[PDB]
């Protein structure tokens, strides 16, 4: 009975069990206590392995893979604060639905709370943020392999969304040659080793029922609000709202084509709010709405019913309207609730939206971040994807641009953390294999700076644009107090990113006008590598331009 | 009444109350929901304020500040994944005793679990890792200020060691001019506002009693094992063990002067373990023992009694010996259990330690990480301090060098994370104001790379040595399997740090020999700035040198 | 601004919201802090109010009501240990699926952890046993009513099974005349007050999909195992299994009619185990299987697939077979996977089941608890229901009796507690309004003795048989060691229950033979009251009779 070999057999059951649920990507950080998991994973031909040294970035890389591939993605981490570093991506996964399977190696129970090295209390350490939590017991052959596979199978089979914490204790010795210890224990699973299915299949589906009065409600004056959803869903929602004759308010994340662009501007005009007051129903598809004027309009509107359709559980209306919360795949839901062609009821809003867009176009020339947001459609890679950072860039793109229907957009908009954007973008790119444009601010680029290491391995060109406005200039847009603003809010770091790019041998451009930026992009798309494009802009020009456009459009 | 003004009144009671328990340093990350806290702290003249954009590094900076100053240190963070980024530093503080007061802003209860932006479930999210957890209620004048101050006074007054999680929800609006809202509510505390005492003084001391049979046990054949303690404590333990005539096995962190150096080597010799089989009592002062040979000996020794004296709570002997766990300040404990002058009882071990040290001396010439560790005592800044990173650097110094008694050594050996060493070193430096030598591995430097921003501001010279052996070479010291070792264990990142240093305008040196290294050091100690010294070494030389010195010393 | 009036309005929103999710029965215990809830409930005409002074019994009465009604049942309790007494029924509800809504009054946050009277920490006190937990905030007008109703609507709407803990803090004053305070706040909800729907409808349904290979599996050699389910599902499962030609092993709780009765005896016969080895699939419907021989058979059998179909979630196979865990209403599942008539495949089992029952019939004469169990069908009230206690009674009825198909049987077989059987039986009776036969052991009756107060109010005759064998004679059946058995296992209490019955003015009988038992029953059914029939039997005769019938049946 070799402890090291049985630790290995136990782990091989866990990992092989994961392969029966769609886990193909596994992200691994270095460690000693995780050896049984890591070796089980390395010897398993089902996995694509990714490696990173920073477990917070490691968690965000897994999140980007899961976000893009829609599979569960596994993560192996050693014991101690490495486990803690998984918290941010786990939090975000719990909010937006990515299936992250966290395999956290642990010390055995005899080494907890007694001053041993790198030993901490890990069961329950993520509180209520995992969808399921499994605390595996100390490995022993007195517990049959069928229990372990069944525990794993219950956890993955019943997972509608979000992360799973699987705490895996192992006693030393961890190293040593494999002998037959644990082989007959494994062989009790019979030909399951050669199968493609779970040992225990427990796969209940969670779905709201068809709404049987939809045919009554679809004849009313409605509004469609389109939040985060897949690209194909964005197209279906566009055609659906058009057939209904209802105005479609489309988020940067919808991929609807935003037929009423610049909603964050024209929702500031009283003609629009007044016309919107006639809506008897709002059907919102998807969630995590971006614009401030749209969030305020949602919070103040009083339709007879407010419906939110999404495949993520729980309340999604922060204004708590009377209405419905419908759990469904958005495309399936539209098939169950089809549109009948009806005469459009909005007259003032389309003209207002065209005028707002025309006001933004009048201001496209200055070499600023507001204009980059407005012109961003001109730089999207062909057959590619966009990853949009948090803070001002997602706001400016939402307010000032009209992104094309069905062009894929990704984001970390569950909790809107600025802590894992580059590594998430690296997962997005690796999962799809498509050329990727990722836009972030300077504080966001500094936060996840070491994720530049990951960006040295992309399967297609990735352009990382860093808008360097010297601090978090979102706090120049909000009414922060002037005396404390720079030190306690903006926090300018007075850096450039040329040396960061050279450190990881990434191409770098710092364009000074539109022609140089166009040159930078045309060069960058030429090879499967990451290019850093730094846009240096005056600190507050973007926030001020957005405010001025808000006032201008509110007086139309 | 004005909600924004009352929010800042509530927060001002919180912050001012912290000043009554020794809180001097406040570390602040940027955010909007944190406005009541941040402005309350910014207006309070009692505080020194530190800022940073990454909350993980922000927490470790507070950890270094508390580590040196031995005072509670406060942290202000906004809602969301920013709070989760504090987990590693909080875990380490829960293990080594630093008192971190985490003030985490939150959305109001009506905005949890409903799709609001940057809103997550925050009460309890650090599980059992905080020493105290307080979930403040939604601010209201119906709860009197005396309750609020009493709650904080209870948490800080009864805080023996570890972190305090204080979750502070605030409702909008957050911005707006201060009016008289909440003024009379505040004035119900009377002249407490001008006092230096807590509103409620609750400060019970936790201490083991004098051991009344100490006069019996100090005459037996004893061994002193010295772990982490303060520099003063290290010298007092050295004199105490010498007076007892007991061998002193001194850790790199003990500051005892290590009168029997290279214990990680000579404890591998059968003559030493055989002599140590005669010990009737082991008195260990401090914890987090570093060396492998010392851990194995502690694990195998069978004295009649094993005592651990430390000012942190809980079990600290991972081999679970029969004996005593004594909670005390080590200097106080030595005073209560004084030595008596007795004849030394070990004869073979001193001869053995001299031989091991000479075997190390014979190999001092090669320009390697083993040799840098052995020679580090020749490079300590006068009246300075040493910060030792984790992985090989602390083990090689521990095994191969003899650090001078009473020279302050700092580290993160609670959980031995490699995730916050640079920001912790910045805090260590800022708290003491002393010149600082910090030594870390390359992966450790990559993990906390953006902490170089913090190192742009030190009050005295800081030398950061980055030992670049291209990966985590601890996994060349351990018997990791050869085929998986590089991809899944070592993870070489093939980088240098000249561009990192250049990005943050730090002086940089890449010495190629001893003479260039001493030139680098002589230059660096001249100004109050950080100098980055990259020592490029061959990947596996350090690990092999250590293994050969172990074998050689085993055969003496 | 009246605090007592607003407390009442907040509570009235909670209680009215509960009426929209089917809550009709509400169980109330006395208290002062619960006043806002209790008075809101007393004013609401939608409710049937039940009262009891023991909150443990109060929790089990609610469990019995919910068990019968198939509707969420509310409970109101005051602050302190009253809340803790709810734990047993809450745990059982989490195992068998009853929806108990626990409204636990609490002190406000300013009175927790400060030495106030009857104030304890109540959020989270039921750990993971509730399906949902809500910690309501301190009541205030600044949190809108639509939030409070939405929070409850989410909790009740997404509740598939089990209890909900809603902690309701209230500040003083609690008493005082209703003025206008909070009226306009309530009025925000508009005509929701005159509506019969939730404010927010969130009712996603969890169900496994059709098994698309069922047409293959239903023509194999299968076994049907019938656990706990409804009376109607019992009849449909019987007809289904008969049509398939599969042997039906039916539990006491199945109401299948047990066409192969005395399985706890004939599964001890080697011919049966050998014949059932031929089974290629087991489909189990329901769970909480009773018989020891059936649990051992399940644990040892090795069909190709093992399926458990039930309306509750989670793993239900304690032997962790390879197979399927199918979440469904059992009747819906049967219509989705219909039987086609095929010839029976078992040859030995029908004769052996007939023989086993005939061996029981041979021993029916003695006036013992085994024979009472075997003859219990002779005493079932027409158009009534049976409540079976735990320990020996349920096993003896399972092993020795053949209960009619579709005759309702109720029990507390989730955790098999003996702590709330009389108050559960009282709830079963009150919710259905039907005449009831409840059978319990003496220690179970002592445990819940004050529940006789509840049994003074039944809407139809309830007969309570107490089998008094002087202690827990289950431990004479189990191989407990003889020397410790009486003091530490059996614990005879040497009591009778005539004075118990007299205390609560219930008719009482102690029959000495079958004619006297018949006479006692004939008297008891004449009025809508509770009758106590104590059957005094020799301590170990039941266990001995069961053992001997097992041996006899194994030698067939
Ligand atoms: C991990 C963490 N910790 C702190 C924060 C707080 N926080 C923000 C949220 O407030 C805004 C998101 C949102 O609400 O949707 S934005 C922001 C500044 C970003 O600076 P930048 O990259 O330079 O971009 P810029 O502002 O355009 O100039 C910070 C520091 C956070 N989000 N995440
Ligand atoms: C946050 C976190 N996550 C992962 C680990 C696992 N872990 C280690 C534990 O074995 C620590 C040992 C020790 O006890 O000191 S060491 C180690 C390698 C460090 O590489 P380096 O800096 O380049 O230095 P070198 O090895 O000397 O070459 C890692 C990656 C961790 N400790 N903390
Ligand atoms: C609250 C709690 N605490 C303790 C127990 C343990 N426990 C039992 C479980 O082992 C068995 C339940 C079952 O499986 O059905 S049975 C049992 C004896 C009951 O005595 P009885 O009424 O006199 O009946 P008789 O045994 O037939 O003579 C006890 C004391 C419990 N169940 N619940
Ligand atoms: Mn910025
Ligand atoms: Mn290294
Ligand atoms: Mn009994």
mmCIF file of C-alpha atoms and ligand atoms in Angstrom, chain C residues 369 389-395 412-413 415-421 440-445 447 467 469-475 478 489-490, ligand 3:
data_model
loop_
_atom_site.group_PDB
_atom_site.id
_atom_site.type_symbol
_atom_site.label_atom_id
_atom_site.label_comp_id
_atom_site.label_asym_id
_atom_site.label_seq_id
_atom_site.Cartn_x
_atom_site.Cartn_y
_atom_site.Cartn_z
ATOM 1 C CA UNK C 369 -46.910 -6.208 18.586
ATOM 2 C CA UNK C 389 -44.232 5.761 13.874
ATOM 3 C CA UNK C 390 -40.551 4.953 13.734
ATOM 4 C CA UNK C 391 -38.442 2.146 15.273
ATOM 5 C CA UNK C 392 -40.045 -1.349 15.418
ATOM 6 C CA UNK C 393 -43.607 -0.464 14.397
ATOM 7 C CA UNK C 394 -42.732 0.613 10.855
ATOM 8 C CA UNK C 395 -40.394 -2.347 10.336
ATOM 9 C CA UNK C 412 -41.353 10.863 9.384
ATOM 10 C CA UNK C 413 -38.858 8.644 7.577
ATOM 11 C CA UNK C 415 -34.347 11.334 9.479
ATOM 12 C CA UNK C 416 -36.531 8.720 11.260
ATOM 13 C CA UNK C 417 -36.678 10.871 14.387
ATOM 14 C CA UNK C 418 -38.736 9.762 17.364
ATOM 15 C CA UNK C 419 -39.018 13.375 18.573
ATOM 16 C CA UNK C 420 -42.198 14.665 16.876
ATOM 17 C CA UNK C 421 -44.539 11.802 15.978
ATOM 18 C CA UNK C 440 -46.202 4.848 17.933
ATOM 19 C CA UNK C 441 -43.835 3.239 20.475
ATOM 20 C CA UNK C 442 -43.678 4.138 24.182
ATOM 21 C CA UNK C 443 -40.430 6.132 24.108
ATOM 22 C CA UNK C 444 -41.701 8.023 21.060
ATOM 23 C CA UNK C 445 -44.919 8.814 22.917
ATOM 24 C CA UNK C 447 -40.740 12.124 23.799
ATOM 25 C CA UNK C 467 -47.156 0.002 21.739
ATOM 26 C CA UNK C 469 -42.903 -2.756 25.310
ATOM 27 C CA UNK C 470 -41.056 -0.794 28.042
ATOM 28 C CA UNK C 471 -38.239 0.897 26.161
ATOM 29 C CA UNK C 472 -36.734 1.067 22.701
ATOM 30 C CA UNK C 473 -36.929 -2.611 21.786
ATOM 31 C CA UNK C 474 -35.342 -1.928 18.390
ATOM 32 C CA UNK C 475 -32.139 -2.513 20.384
ATOM 33 C CA UNK C 478 -30.016 -5.123 16.778
ATOM 34 C CA UNK C 489 -29.959 1.280 24.910
ATOM 35 C CA UNK C 490 -33.433 0.047 25.866
HETATM 36 C C1 LIG D 3 -34.821 12.008 18.033
HETATM 37 C C2 LIG D 3 -34.232 10.623 17.980
HETATM 38 N N1 LIG D 3 -33.336 10.236 18.906
HETATM 39 C C3 LIG D 3 -32.805 9.044 18.885
HETATM 40 C C4 LIG D 3 -33.156 8.168 17.931
HETATM 41 C C5 LIG D 3 -32.547 6.791 17.925
HETATM 42 N N2 LIG D 3 -33.544 5.772 18.055
HETATM 43 C C6 LIG D 3 -34.064 4.963 17.061
HETATM 44 C C7 LIG D 3 -33.557 5.061 15.638
HETATM 45 O O1 LIG D 3 -32.468 4.255 15.651
HETATM 46 C C8 LIG D 3 -34.434 4.341 14.657
HETATM 47 C C9 LIG D 3 -35.633 5.063 14.087
HETATM 48 C C10 LIG D 3 -35.982 4.303 12.821
HETATM 49 O O2 LIG D 3 -35.137 3.922 12.090
HETATM 50 O O3 LIG D 3 -37.063 4.055 12.382
HETATM 51 S S1 LIG D 3 -35.139 4.067 17.639
HETATM 52 C C11 LIG D 3 -35.211 4.345 19.053
HETATM 53 C C12 LIG D 3 -36.129 3.699 20.071
HETATM 54 C C13 LIG D 3 -37.540 4.222 20.073
HETATM 55 O O4 LIG D 3 -38.275 3.587 21.052
HETATM 56 P P1 LIG D 3 -39.793 3.211 20.939
HETATM 57 O O5 LIG D 3 -40.692 4.176 20.766
HETATM 58 O O6 LIG D 3 -40.045 2.817 22.223
HETATM 59 O O7 LIG D 3 -40.104 2.064 19.870
HETATM 60 P P2 LIG D 3 -39.619 0.560 19.837
HETATM 61 O O8 LIG D 3 -38.237 0.658 19.647
HETATM 62 O O9 LIG D 3 -40.148 -0.002 18.761
HETATM 63 O O10 LIG D 3 -39.897 -0.116 21.058
HETATM 64 C C14 LIG D 3 -34.290 5.386 19.350
HETATM 65 C C15 LIG D 3 -34.059 6.018 20.689
HETATM 66 C C16 LIG D 3 -34.086 8.548 16.976
HETATM 67 N N3 LIG D 3 -34.475 7.650 15.964
HETATM 68 N N4 LIG D 3 -34.605 9.755 17.010
#
